[PDB]
Design a protein around this ligand. Structure first.
Ligand SMILES: O=c1[nH]c(=O)n([C@@H]2O[C@H](CO)[C@@H](O)[C@H]2O)cc1F
Ligand SMILES: O=c1[nH]c(=O)n([C@@H]2O[C@H](CO)[C@@H](O)[C@H]2O)cc1F
Ligand SMILES: O=c1[nH]c(=O)n([C@@H]2O[C@H](CO)[C@@H](O)[C@H]2O)cc1F
Ligand SMILES: O=c1[nH]c(=O)n([C@@H]2O[C@H](CO)[C@@H](O)[C@H]2O)cc1F
Ligand SMILES: O=c1[nH]c(=O)n([C@@H]2O[C@H](CO)[C@@H](O)[C@H]2O)cc1F
Ligand SMILES: O=c1[nH]c(=O)n([C@@H]2O[C@H](CO)[C@@H](O)[C@H]2O)cc1F
Ligand SMILES: [K+]
Ligand SMILES: [K+]
Ligand SMILES: [K+]
Lengths: 242, 250, 242, 250, 242, 250
């Protein structure tokens, strides 16, 4: 292995330069299955990697695990191996009334509620997605007729307090985040997820292209099939980025 | 006047919902001149407004003056008057070697080195441009064949220390900004300008669409010898691009 | 032109070392008119400059435009041309009950609600006015018998949310500034304006003397003539500073 | 499942109130194997859970995955299930010369270089370990004669820049973290790891007891030449120490 | 004098390496009196120093005065003189219902509501006590059967607003600290005092061992004898640390 | 006692509304001695209080001890007792070449390097002195012909690292303060002391008038060789100046 965590060698990628990075290890195979000659490369910790062909071009699929920390490791090590483009496919919770479960969301930029993005650029730097990847994702979504929403996403280091959930053990939310969801709502933020801030920031500040798309599995103001459409959309986007 | 600073009435706009907002008052007429039936509406402080027609649709052109403060006033008051889409056309200094004077830059999002954006959203919120406006700007730039670059822009509250210029009275830059340009360069930031952070943040957090395009009049990594001609010509292309973008946004 | 924005040459100032800097371009001529041999020097963007004589000494009057950004450019470029003393005359909104419209306010120091001051000194540095300029302004105000108030001023980068105005398009104020006016009131702050923080900080941290005086055109807790008195006061102060 | 991610039910724990939480899923079974009647309960995402008996008391072992985010989920959901005591056993990089690979480190408190801890308490709150858990860990380490060091640990959201590693794709470290390792060294910080800040803070601020122990697999001040054997042996001792500590905490 | 403030010479300490540092000058003699051959060494400003013997080992007792500023001076200068271990004995206000006046509190780490700790380490660094000193204090407390509580302490630069007291001249608390006590309570913080944050941080970040124990003289949610027990406990702890 | 720390009763002040507040308890009597009918009122912790008459008006003199924490207690409790005006007289270290030992410095505002001021107003609020008190101090200094300097002062919570002193036990200064003195120097800051930030902020934000004057006992830019005599003489003039200022403020 040429990297510390992924257990992958440069040759394993066979010249691949684009990677689809879902958060859940169990989704890696599903994504690879939509492409040609899918093969499992490695599985260590929360990092599962598969290789496949798209239009005769080798493509990588690697899980990041939940959170910016594990995400930064995967992205960094994949970059060390030649990957220059990253497309994240995730699951998300909508916080706007007009957005419905099943809808697909494309992130233009993210509210940085994480700590890892700060290890690449100060807070004033935008966690913005690459224009080409965003475009590809939008078109891909349109190509299959999925109800899509494009905009800002709140990327949190926590699933609970950071997303102002009170149905918890403590049933309490620290002051900084109390009343925070309502604030994001009034600002037009579409959803909550946990890896885009780190992904977009570290990529945008290091010459790497990144895109972000997620399927709505829940709406805070009010599933397997939704994941399916989002997966197709990201593979279709990758195709347009090759 | 229905607003405190612009000296404009709702009726003046004749139903206009899009405005092109240059920083310099003197550029307002130039921009309006590329459209039909251009008419001056008002002039107060650094706020000069003109109205014109584009494809049979009334369009506004209003100068913001330099900086997020004056920019936030103009945008806020124009919004009070019905404007929902804002396209900024400015001048900028490139900080990357591969970018040349005369090139056109489209901002996807901005590094917030201003104070006004913070009056609309905390620092963690991205100063991102509207996807539709950015797309229109990109296509418009392509439509006339201008050498274009798309990416991140550093928007500063100051022309000098914030952009780490030392050719100043004090010849000194406060610690926070010392060595800052090099940091931005390593991060891929394309340029320095002074209104996008405020514009994009206040719009993105209030349901308003905004786009940002600027012409390169200088490159910080490549010494000098400016050319009023070339410079005036660069402004020309950027103006044409923003008007073309507006057309696609109407 | 020896500077990038002002369109002025060192010789234009004829040895002037003090400048009165109003925010509104249209007020420049009014101020110059109270002095001798007033002459317009230039007009570019929001920067209008006039020269005049006061007690046989050349004095500059230059508009800064609204906000610290344009203010820092004007001050910096004027300094490059020899100006060492700056007196700002502005308009302001009082936030204390005992202060009335028409009253004149002299700022001793400012609450930094701007971004430009930070480009000269970290937030912990005080946006304090020069003792000599403050003194001159106080005496000048007294010399004409104007009802005067001396104290702290809140200098905001925005006219609306930063000054907690809700009569706006969004009718909303970001969390950081919600309930902020009341806080300033309890702290004795006298008013809101938009250039003193940047002016005083950049001057106080660069060996430049600065003073700040403004006329109250509105009281948040409850016009042409007020501007008139403030203008006289600043010209009278300049006279004592020459 | 009574929780959203762990896929566990209250009944699965059989009254367990203490959990050993390693970062790597693959270590869960190893830890459970040192106890009695070890049984796998679930495996979802980076969360692998096993149950076992220690002195006739049911004990849980659950992987957190790398980082405070996944750690906070696991801890929160385990707490929802009754766990009140958490003992983390990890791997770490030493940054002090006197500390050797193979040594065991017990964290009294951590430098918060993460983002998740901030979602439980402001930065001024200390990421301190529970006194009882720390004591148990210290005694346990002593009971087997392991070379131990007790002190402060720097817990980072990143493996690379946050730990000031330059052997990377960009080969660059953002300003805030440039020269940071040397600063931590001068302050006596013993090591770098990636979950203690979040673990200790969220537990210390919510009435939950937590302890932290890690085996040194590398020393940043002493070049390299890792040894899978030694490394695998270090993990072994750390595991034994944490299980022994749990025993004293039951 | 070999130091600027304490008025002490290296020889005065006769090889002492541990010091008990109370906040009140008047408590120095009381503490020294429990040991052998107590002798007053100096008295300057709020810094009173005494020397004594404990198990044949010279020990120092020096008052820090109230607050991190004076505390940092005393600790720094004592360190310059050879002291490597510091045990603070103070008075404190409990903020938890289950803690009673008279109880003894041992601080494991502190919430940094001070400014001095920041002059030694950034805010993210923990104001944690030395494990050995904490252990000694716990055992010492047990040795005399004192009702003890071990945990986190909020160390404030102010006695009033920082501890959210409203019975003041202004009867007002700045926004940052409004509702702060309740927050600390929900987080399990045991008490409020004014020197531990600075003490623990500066020591923990400079290779110096420090411990912190205080007697509860008041409970915010609901005296000479309490001080007595705390003094014994700290002397007993020092004995175990020699 | 009507207050928790000062051990003073409202009656003790006999209607006094102004207090001179030195940092050192030992200076309280010296200051009181220049006035009429000086009497010691109390002595507790670092708080020593004396009362005296100035032009037939009762005046208080109370030591604050070193630092904003003890300073805030004294000021708060004195205010509870009726004091509305505070004049601080201290000792200071100059950081500018043109300032000499023995010179007197009047602070117009302070750089807030303390923590206590933040307990009264956020960092953006200026630690500015009262205009009337500053004026009185300036005139008083002039009245005796002392070489005076008026300007900004850096008020630090620490005597050593915060004032970037390396002649210490650790011989190290935390990153935030490394190279800080030079920055303050370039900004024109005249000196370092340890109570003005807290004093001016808490007073300026609570309707209390405050002034600040200090005598230079050392200049950081000009090596050393202190003189107890000169030093004791500098304190003398500063004391005379503050008493004279109080007289003009009564
Ligand atoms: O409400 C949600 N919050 C959230 O963070 N997610 C995403 O799905 C995972 C949480 O289970 C995280 O990786 C995150 O990216 C989904 C959601 F539905
Ligand atoms: O180097 C530059 N920096 C800069 O900020 N600008 C832009 O032009 C104006 C300053 O001249 C500002 O409004 C800003 O948007 C142009 C430049 F060429
Ligand atoms: O309420 C007010 N707020 C305010 O900012 N001002 C000042 O006048 C201009 C706003 O029109 C700004 O330049 C500012 O300095 C006046 C006011 F009356
Ligand atoms: O140098 C190291 N840095 C580090 O963070 N670790 C730990 O091991 C994992 C990364 O490999 C993280 O969970 C972390 O806790 C180990 C190391 F050897
Ligand atoms: O409520 C309290 N708050 C407090 O800060 N203290 C402590 O006792 C002194 C206050 O009088 C300070 O030195 C501090 O350490 C005691 C208390 F009882
Ligand atoms: O260099 C100096 N630094 C300093 O802080 N002081 C002042 O004198 C005391 C420290 O000796 C503090 O109260 C402070 O106000 C004097 C000095 F000479
Ligand atoms: K993870
Ligand atoms: K302007
Ligand atoms: K003190």
């Amino acid at each position: 292995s040429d990297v510390f965590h992924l257990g992958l060698t440069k040759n394993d990628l066979q010249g691949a330069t684009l990677a689809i990075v879902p958060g859940d290890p169990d989704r890696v195979e599903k994504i690879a299955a939509l492409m040609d000659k899918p093969v499992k490369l490695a599985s260590h910790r929360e990092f599962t990697t598969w290789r496949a062909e798209l239009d005769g071009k080798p493509v990588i699929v690697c899980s990041t695990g939940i959170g910016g920390p594990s995400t930064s490791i995967a992205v960094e090590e994949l970059a060390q191996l030649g990957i220059r483009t990253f497309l994240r496919i995730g699951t998300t919770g909508a916080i706007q009334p007009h957005i419905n479960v099943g809808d697909v969301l494309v992130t233009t930029a993210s509210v940085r509620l994480d700590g890892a993005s700060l290890h690449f650029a100060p807070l004033e730097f935008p966690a913005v997605a690459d224009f080409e990847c965003t475009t590809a994702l939008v078109e891909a979504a349109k190509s299959i007729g999925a109800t899509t929403h494009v905009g800002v996403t709140a990327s949190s280091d926590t699933f609970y307090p950071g997303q102002e959930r009170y149905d918890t053990y403590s049933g309490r939310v620290v002051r900084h985040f109390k009343g925070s969801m309502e604030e994001w709502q009034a600002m037009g933020v579409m959803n909550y997820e946990m890896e885009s801030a780190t992904l977009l920031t570290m990529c945008a500040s290091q010459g790497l292209r990144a895109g972000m798309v997620a399927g709505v599995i829940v709406n805070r103001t009010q599933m397997k099939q939704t994941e399916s459409h989002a997966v197709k959309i990201v593979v279709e986007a990758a195709r347009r980025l090759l």
